[PDB]
Design a protein around this ligand. Structure first.
Ligand SMILES: [Cl-]
Lengths: 95, 95
């Protein structure tokens, strides 16, 4: 439960097999978050535990905070960029 | 940090390649703990995180609490039985 908001970060490029989605992500990635919520304490915790929690709390926060925006495509792309940033954030933490 | 002492449990049989250790464990397993410390909250946490923590806290507790007993052999056997019981304890928790 002891989580913080991490610093803004470069959005990673996510790849898709479908040409449409692959290009859609590139053209729309500015619409997604560029920071994530995690637990500093998820330290030396294993990566999967940290990322599991970071993804859950981060997506939850964006649901609430977002008081015609997103479609099914955007939701899943947002989830993937959030996961990658959580992994990056865990590397930041490791030592 | 929110950990509990779990209920006593049947000691699992641990196996060794060395005939001496394999039999030593069987003849001396009564000398080791038969319960472990864990975090109920390490729930739906992944198994490795739960067991990582359970093993660490459990062995730490036995160090303190133990105010000519154990040798190098006993220490490592104790660690292995503790790990197995932590895994059992995590299965108890899973749902
Ligand atoms: Cl893992």
């Amino acid at each position: 439960g002891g989580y913080v908001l991490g610093s803004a970060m470069s959005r990673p490029i996510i790849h898709f097999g479908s040409d449409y989605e692959d290009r859609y992500y590139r053209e729309n990635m500015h619409r997604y978050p560029n920071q994530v919520y995690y637990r500093p304490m998820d330290e030396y915790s294993n990566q999967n535990n940290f990322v599991h929690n970071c993804v859950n709390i981060t997506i939850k926060q964006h649901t609430v905070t977002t008081t015609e925006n997103f479609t099914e495509t955007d939701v899943k792309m947002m989830e993937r960029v959030v996961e990658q940033m959580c992994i990056t954030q865990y590397e930041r933490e490791s030592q």
